[PDB]
């Protein structure tokens, strides 16, 4: 039963590194990523310039599910796909669940619980890929909610 | 009539820059690129590590046509898509032509004819994105054939 692995964590939590190393050590897995698609369709404009519009986001979402479906419908060599996004939004996670249940695939979770102080340190050294402190703060809160930790 | 713009040229010919600036000045256009997809599915492994296998290339091709179709089937705001690849291979160009003729779309060509000496200079300053001299040489020959220029 092919797997759909969702990485869960704020930017800077180690998701991309894990995904890259996992695929290298586990033949048969492929990566699917929202940031890659957003940058691609805009021909690699400066990250800060990307405007999260309903039109673009819908296109990016469409690319993710169609790619997942095309790959998962592969041969026996295909073991699964990795959705290397933050996946902090409950609605997005539910989408992948209903998607997998519809085609007989198994959804797994790869959690990257990293301390706030550490996330800030890493985020402060990513330049163009860095995220504004307020946005990071908000994603960290969503992560705590996912973990079932208390939040204000 | 929505358009499918194919960029034609060797790496270093200015394709990506043109695509980025064109999309910024022409609302309604979106970028589709083989290199972006190849890097994405492999979780951004080192470029030199990518092995052009039949399995991976087929997946990447599938992502291109499905994305093009999903985007082009958009609203009236969608003016077209840009296939920012080298497109030096006659068979790939024919594929996009039959594809467009099948769904009532128009294919256009954006040629980047750059002198060999210049291509070498630019390629020598791209590091990780640089291409081995022998491969560049071969793509330059294919470009000349496309232009209808004599080759040995």
Swiss-Prot record, chains A, B:
Keywords: ATP-binding, DNA damage, DNA repair, Evasion of bacteria-mediated translation shutoff by virus, Host-virus interaction, Hydrolase, Kinase, Nucleotide-binding, Transferase
GO molecular-function term, one example from the UniProt record: deoxynucleotide 3'-phosphatase activity
Keyword Hydrolase: yes
EC number: 2.7.1.78, 3.1.3.34
Reactions this protein catalyses: a 5'-end dephospho-2'-deoxyribonucleoside-DNA + ATP = a 5'-end 5'-phospho-2'-deoxyribonucleoside-DNA + ADP + H(+); a 2'-deoxyribonucleoside 3'-phosphate + H2O = a 2'-deoxyribonucleoside + phosphate
Any single biological process term in GO: DNA repair
Reported pH dependence: Optimum pH is 6.
Cofactor dependence: Mg(2+)
Free-text function comment from the UniProt entry: Acts as a 5'-hydroxyl kinase, a 3'-phosphatase and a 2',3'-cyclic phosphodiesterase. Catalyzes the transfer of the terminal phosphate of ATP to the 5'-hydroxyl termini of ribo- and deoxyribonucleotides. In the presence of ADP the enzyme also catalyzes an exchange reaction. In the exchange reaction, an excess ADP causes the enzyme to transfer the 5' terminal phosphate from phosphorylated DNA to ADP. Involved in countering a host defense mechanism which activates T4-induced anticodon nuclease and shuts off viral translation.
Quaternary structure note: Homotetramer.
Name used for this protein in its record: Polynucleotide kinase
Annotated source species: Enterobacteria phage T4 (Bacteriophage T4)
Upper classification of the organism: Viruses, Duplodnaviria, Heunggongvirae, Uroviricota, Caudoviricetes
Shown part of the complete sequence: 1 to 152 of 301
